[PDB]
Design a protein around this ligand. Structure first.
Ligand SMILES: Nc1nc2c(ncn2[C@@H]2O[C@H](COP(=O)(O)OP(=O)(O)OP(=O)(O)O)[C@@H](O)[C@H]2O)c(=O)[nH]1
Ligand SMILES: Nc1nc2c(ncn2[C@@H]2O[C@H](COP(=O)(O)OP(=O)(O)O)[C@@H](O)[C@H]2O)c(=O)[nH]1
Ligand SMILES: Nc1nc2c(ncn2[C@@H]2O[C@H](COP(=O)(O)OP(=O)(O)O)[C@@H](O)[C@H]2O)c(=O)[nH]1
Ligand SMILES: [Mg+2]
Lengths: 431, 101, 50, 437, 101, 431
């Protein structure tokens, strides 16, 4: 009866939460009204992980939706699966952060943090285990980043021994889609580094490339991308809800990934992702399932692991499936090329096997790769920040509400320290 | 279930009185529009959908500020048409991304 | 052995409970008062709007 | 919910308000009498009008505009025209004597009387709100009440209302086209006095709209009605995300902080695409790449300044219609491949995008035709320095031997304020050069 | 195709809950109770004694009517019991004649 | 077989008491005419506590309605459940004296107090063993806060043995609605201290906060506020009327809750007060009932419980439950929130369960807290009174009707004395 309090922060956060709750309501067999219409008892045996209890056969999510603009809350309420959400967990403002980390953290937004911590306390001590909290936020927005970082700071101050994963839509390398996004990304990572426990860096351009090259789809919209991110969420927290031959929970995954506390930025990944017409050309077995999951095309982040070294790799396999082949392929990728693998960790693969496949699949897999190749994304964010900061561009907006350049210099000091730490643990030898 | 049926009885008992007064005012040739705006289906002050699955209640989503201010409604027909013109009944995202089984 | 103690993870845990508190709000910015504007004279000599 | 009060001032303000409020009413479905037929038995719960129109409890959608002017002619034309019962007649403020294209007369003598009346009107329309996004002032730099009374309005509104964003649509004087002669004096003065009180200041050149209408809209003889159709489409595409449901919806304060690098430089350029007419839009698809290339085409801007003689400091593109984000990023990347688009040296993240769902609304009689997708692009460039130098040369060349100065002295402003405004715009030119290099 | 937990907390059991309320008490209620206590009232709830200590316990009890390990009376029982009354009487007589003397 | 009378005083007290009788009449199943038409026999098992038999099968409330203005009184008579009172307890006045403690206690009301005491005596020795009285009034006017407290003093010198309840609406900084409220409240608290056994201070500001931010009412009016106050009254005196697993008599609560003889100013509360939309999203259990009890949002006074120390705390539950979990939840609140409790009183929560729930939801529980945060209300009323008193504003009415500055400043002295008594037992060193 371990469980997670889910949190949606920002416009991106509310859309990602809506699609995530849709996909796991479909996973557990729950209609938009909130009633169980599934057939298997395994779909209902562990439902307190994400769902609370209401009057009747209702099943409300244990989610808190936070926004400073009313339009996104309007969309989530009035779209599909809006009936299932509680009206009191819709905590929101009216003015708007306006793409400013300062205006989402220090001024208004710190005016909502008391109410949001009230609701987080509400559904946090309305529990018995509370494995942890989840924040599906975006880096590059005002209330996506500043509000999210403030909430993570307060929640980690109150409950410091609990899993605090974040899903961190990071800025794209090419085509910015936001101007002050290097400022927001640097000043938000500066809080995530010593606040969160684990972070799944997801990139919109990489999701576009997946939905275009692999799944064809030509027009990939946002529902498809959001369903990939939500399927990654299910592939992460599937062994905690469903029985497996060898299951792994959030604490177990965190322990087997991070070797040092400031190394919790990972690579999402899902398999199989094949098109409609290519679904009847490829066999769906363990070898294809692991090679399409280790493919660098399939990397849900925006940095090639070919130039870089894996620290650790998590493979969460799913389905009634043999696992001698699973262990043999986890061995075989390392033995084929251990050059893209740290030699000071001998067997750097954590493996979980769950019995119940995701709804609509026979057998699937999920990738969580702690790599030293993510340092180039952080270096890119740092160089964009200092390029836009040495001329003090877009700085009056942040300094008007109560911070100064000292905080930006501290953020860059921490950022470059983590970049050097990744370089050190990449180039470090065994002896 | 009896509570849900009581809410249904509440709505069907209010609406006959509302229809009687609306018909009388329409016979008397009034504006009718404030009465028709007040006599909306649902059981709350929100401007949202009726939410027929949850006993037909338009919940009250409120802003945390000095004076409450309800969450508005923006979903039109043309916006929904161009929203679902490419994706097509949003449960089809799963079927579009493979996920056939 | 005394299994009467050591029961945080042993038996079903009843929820430890906090206190609640009120919320203040956004505290909207100032609107510049009804007294602040002195309307121009209408009755008398030359006016500007009437 | 997210309200925006429109502050139409001057003859340009009144005409732009007419041709913009007709678009607003027909886009929201509101009839000229005020009521919405809008099949109210089916649905009818859409509060998409609660940015520009206020309820009465009776179905009367009173707008949120204050048509202020000094001559009674255009305001009485509004009060006589088809949108007569739509507007509250206490919202259409008029004076008696015109400013006669004098900043001094419109700011010190005539403007000092009715500013209190219009500010009390602003107070009533402001506390008949639930949280105000920002005022929108549609004025002209040509001269008179569009430059001096707008000055006094902003100088009072900055003190009265908090931060309270203060968006500007401005009729900038064209490089060679001019209907007046004290346009440089008025423009220098109003730029100096609204430098520290404005947040964004979109200028539009009537010569550039003339070129656009004669080339793209295929109009042999355009006029101010068509010019204000273009301005109405610009402002609708700007504040459509505040009203309508979108995917990457971008409200009024986002594209200020994503576009304005420094508080003194708040002078973006607004470009709309496609501006093609019906007989030629019959002939090709108006896809996302085509309309993005149309916005970045230099002979489609609405101020006659060459963007290739300048550096794009920031660019905020608002796509509107059937628009898919991978096409957005593909078009942006294809734009960024070209080297004749030179973004500024210190801003590599030069783009802020927004996507709104509803296609732009067409008008029955306007020459812009009904498209299913469009772009409004607002860009800060260093290419406005050539326009500022063009008008600076005219101001110095007219102030060298003191032409049309005794009028400003007689109706009130002192001799030194011309020099203060002169050195202020010289400082702005040096600021543009410094942020450009 | 049922399931253990599914059947356990979605029971197909149709009990007999009375709710025999006059349709005038039921209309004077749910008009105070329009926003506060908007639910079907629990008139079926009995007291703890009334619902726990029922005659059905004695009806379904299968105890043997003679408990097979109980002691009997006998032929000298009544005389032995009234002998205690003798002890009280013929000690009180001696005690109170001593009190008199 | 213990009975308490009801005495309504003033417009506020008369409307609140009218709604109180109107919501307990259908709690016991009574006609507007007065005849029994309820469901269970337990509704009539304990009926002599509030009612008297008449000719035929009809019942008359044991209530005296006292007000100087006939409009409020005949509005109460013409309202719903108005044709149930005996038309001999209605004691109208002559003038509209009003918002004037002198025109209450000293003039006008002294000419009516004899008739009111006569009708109260007639209703008082008309029973076999009188337990006590409850009186409903507001400390803002001149009828509720004036000659009502005169009635309190006269009853105290007449029957100096019985339990006394005053459900007093006390003024607030916001929703003030009257300019002589500090004068009336400061003159009335002096009589409320040494003449009552327990008082219930109720704030219109907190009532509006509950009715607008928790019940989500479009038109809150006053019937809803009186419904809240009346539900609190029924939750208090339900253990006299219904059997329970353990019961809480009025004198039992008076013994358990006031430690020292002049600290009997309790702020009330009630749970569950929930919105129509959000009623289907929470289930009804003792744990979340404890939240919605102890929440500061659902406290019927504007005091902040974090700004003080709970001396004693009630939990009068009403429904079908397990009080193993009731008792351990009352333990758990003290175990966690140990800062906001007096450490020299161990387990300072008196709990009871009265079996038969209120009509409607399955469970409820009312709250009576003797917090030290009521000194915010008293300190603010006292400082407003001494702000208005040094300039002697609105004092010529009181001096004309007969007072002096000696009585005004001795009321001020006793009022700050009560503030000092609560500050003494607020946070300090116990040993
Ligand atoms: N684009 C556009 N420009 C206009 C319009 N009306 C006026 N203008 C411009 O405004 C300039 C002069 O300002 P006006 O608006 O005509 O006059 P005013 O602002 O009311 O001030 P006064 O001259 O004192 O009446 C002219 O040079 C025009 O170019 C219009 O409807 N559309
Ligand atoms: N994956 C995903 N990305 C999004 C979504 N909405 C916005 N984004 C990205 O996030 C950035 C803007 O963040 P935004 O939502 O405005 O942050 P906020 O203002 O704090 O809510 C843009 O660059 C988009 O590419 C979404 O629904 N899903
Ligand atoms: N809760 C509640 N308060 C009321 C009601 N009517 C009046 N009040 C309060 O009582 C105060 C006025 O006191 P008033 O009734 O005139 O006292 P009176 O002189 O004894 O009648 C106002 O400040 C109101 O806040 C009511 O129906 N409910
Ligand atoms: Mg004019």
């Amino acid at each position: 009866m371990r469980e997670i309090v889910h949190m949606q922060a920002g416009q991106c956060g509310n859309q990602i939460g809506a699609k995530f709750w849709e996909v796991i309501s479909d996973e557990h067999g729950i209609d938009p009204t909130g009633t169980y219409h599934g057939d298997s008892d395994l779909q209902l045996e562990r439902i307190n992980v994400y769902y609370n209890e209401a009057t009747g056969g209702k099943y409300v999510p244990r989610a808190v939706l936070v926004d400073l603009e009313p339009g996104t809350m309007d969309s989530v309420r009035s779209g599909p699966f809006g009936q299932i959400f509680r009206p009191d967990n819709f905590v929101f403002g009216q003015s708007g952060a306006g793409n400013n980390w300062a205006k989402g953290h220090y001024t208004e937004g710190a005016e909502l943090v008391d109410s949001v911590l009230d609701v987080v306390r509400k559904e946090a001590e309305s529990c018995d285990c509370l494995q942890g909290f989840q924040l599906t936020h975006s880096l590059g927005g005002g209330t996506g980043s500043g509000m999210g970082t403030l909430l993570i700071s307060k929640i980690r101050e109150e409950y410091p021994d609990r899993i605090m994963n974040t899903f961190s839509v990071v800025p794209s390398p090419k085509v910015s889609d936001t101007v002050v996004e290097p400022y927001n990304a640097t000043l938000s990572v500066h809080q995530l580094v010593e606040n969160t426990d684990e972070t799944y860096c997801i990139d919109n351009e990489a999701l576009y490339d997946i939905c275009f090259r692999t799944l064809k789809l030509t027009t990939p919209t946002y529902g498809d991308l959001n369903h990939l991110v939500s399927a990654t969420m299910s592939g992460v927290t599937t062994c905690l809800r469903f029985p497996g031959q060898l299951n792994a929970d959030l604490r177990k995954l965190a322990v087997n990934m991070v070797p040092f506390p400031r190394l919790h930025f990972f690579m999402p990944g899902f398999a199989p992702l094949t098109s409609r017409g290519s679904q009847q050309y490829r066999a769906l077995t363990v070898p294809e399932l692991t090679q399409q999951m280790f493919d660098a095309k399939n990397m849900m982040a925006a940095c090639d692991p070919r130039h870089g070294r894996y620290l650790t790799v998590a493979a969460i396999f799913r389905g009634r499936m043999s696992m001698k082949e699973v262990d043999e392929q986890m061995l075989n990728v390392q033995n084929k090329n251990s050059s893209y693998f740290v030699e000071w960790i001998p067997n750097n693969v954590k493996t979980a096997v769950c019995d119940i496949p995701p709804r609509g699949l026979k057998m699937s897999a999920t990738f969580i790769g702690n790599s030293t190749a993510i340092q180039e994304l952080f270096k890119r964010i740092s160089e964009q920040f200092t390029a836009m900061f040495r001329r003090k561009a877009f700085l009056h907006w942040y300094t008007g509400e109560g911070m100064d350049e000292m905080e930006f210099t501290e953020a860059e000091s921490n950022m470059n320290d983590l970049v050097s730490e990744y370089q050190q643990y990449q180039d470090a030898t065994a002896e | 279930k009896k509570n849900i049926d009581l809410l249904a009885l509440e709505e069907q008992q209010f609406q006959e009185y509302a229809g009687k007064v609306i018909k009388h005012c329409k016979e008397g040739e009034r504006n009718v529009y404030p009465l028709e705006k007040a006599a909306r289906e649902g059981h709350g002050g929100g401007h949202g959908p009726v939410f027929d699955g949850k006993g037909g209640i338009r919940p009250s989503y409120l802003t945390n500020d000095r004076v409450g201010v309800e969450l508005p409604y923006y979903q039109k027909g043309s916006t929904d048409e161009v929203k679902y013109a490419h994706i097509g009944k949003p449960s089809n995202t799963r079927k579009r991304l493979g996920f056939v089984w | 052995y005394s299994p009467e103690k050591a029961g945080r993870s042993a038996h079903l845990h009843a929820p430890e409970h906090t206190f609640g508190s009120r919320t203040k709000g956004i505290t909207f910015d100032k609107s510049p008062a009804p007294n602040n504007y002195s309307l121009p004279s209408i009755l008398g000599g030359r006016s500007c709007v009437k | 919910m997210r309200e925006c009060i429109s502050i139409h001032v001057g003859q340009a303000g009144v005409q732009i308000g007419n041709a913009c409020w007709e678009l607003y009413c027909l886009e929201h479905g509101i009839q000229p009498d005020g009521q919405m037929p809008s099949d109210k038995t089916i649905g009818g719960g859409d509060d998409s009008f609660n940015t520009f129109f206020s309820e009465t409890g009776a179905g009367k959608h009173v707008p949120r505009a204050v048509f202020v002017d000094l001559e009674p002619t255009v305001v009485d034309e509004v009060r006589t025209g088809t949108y007569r019962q739509l507007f509250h007649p206490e919202q259409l403020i008029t004076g008696k004597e015109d400013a006669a294209n004098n900043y001094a007369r419109g700011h010190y003598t005539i403007g000092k009387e009715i500013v209190d009346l219009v500010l009390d009107r602003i107070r009533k329309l402001a506390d008949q709100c639930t949280g105000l996004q920002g005022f929108l002032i549609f004025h002209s730099f040509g001269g008179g009440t569009g430059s001096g009374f707008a000055s006094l309005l902003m100088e009072r509104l900055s003190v009265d209302y908090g931060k309270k964003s203060k968006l500007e649509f401005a009729i900038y004087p064209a490089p060679q086209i001019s209907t007046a002669v004290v346009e440089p004096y008025n423009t220098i003065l109003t730029t100096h006095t609204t430098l520290e009180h404005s947040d964004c200041a979109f200028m539009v050149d009537n010569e550039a709209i003339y070129d656009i209408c004669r080339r793209n809209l295929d109009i042999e003889r355009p006029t101010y009605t068509n010019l204000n159709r273009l301005i109405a489409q610009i402002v609708s595409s700007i504040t459509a995300s505040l009203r309508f449901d979108g995917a990457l919806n971008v409200d009024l304060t986002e594209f200020q902080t994503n576009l304005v690098p420094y508080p003194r430089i708040h002078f973006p350029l607004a470009t709309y695409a496609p501006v093609i007419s019906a007989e030629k839009a019959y002939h090709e698809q108006l896809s996302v790449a085509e309309i993005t290339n149309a916005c970045f085409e230099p002979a489609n801007q609405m101020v006659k300044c060459d963007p290739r003689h300048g550096k794009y400091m920031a660019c905020c593109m608002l796509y509107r219609g059937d628009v898919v984000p991978k096409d957005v990023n593909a078009a942006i990347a294809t734009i960024k491949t070209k080297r004749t688009i030179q973004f500024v040296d210190w801003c590599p993240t030069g783009f802020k995008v927004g996507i709104n769902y509803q296609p732009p609304t067409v008008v029955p009689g306007g020459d812009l035709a009904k498209v299913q997708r469009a772009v409004c692009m607002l860009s800060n460039t260093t290419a406005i320095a050539e326009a500022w130098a063009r008008l600076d040369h005219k101001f110095d060349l007219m102030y060298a031997k003191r032409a049309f100065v005794h009028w400003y002295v007689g109706e009130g402003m002192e001799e030194g304020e011309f020099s203060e405004a002169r050195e202020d715009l010289a400082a702005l030119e040096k600021d543009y050069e410094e942020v450009g290099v | 195709i049922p399931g253990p937990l599914i059947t356990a907390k979605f029971p197909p059991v149709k009990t007999s809950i009375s709710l025999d309320t006059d349709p005038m008490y039921s209309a004077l209620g749910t008009s105070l109770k329009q926003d506060i206590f908007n639910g079907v009232p629990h008139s079926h709830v009995k007291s703890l004694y009334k619902s726990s200590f029922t005659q059905d316990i004695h009806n379904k009890s299968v105890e043997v009517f003679p408990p097979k390990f109980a002691i009997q009376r006998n032929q000298d029982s009544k005389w032995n019991e009234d002998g205690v009354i003798r002890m009280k009487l013929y000690k009180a007589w001696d005690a109170m004649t001593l009190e008199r003397l």
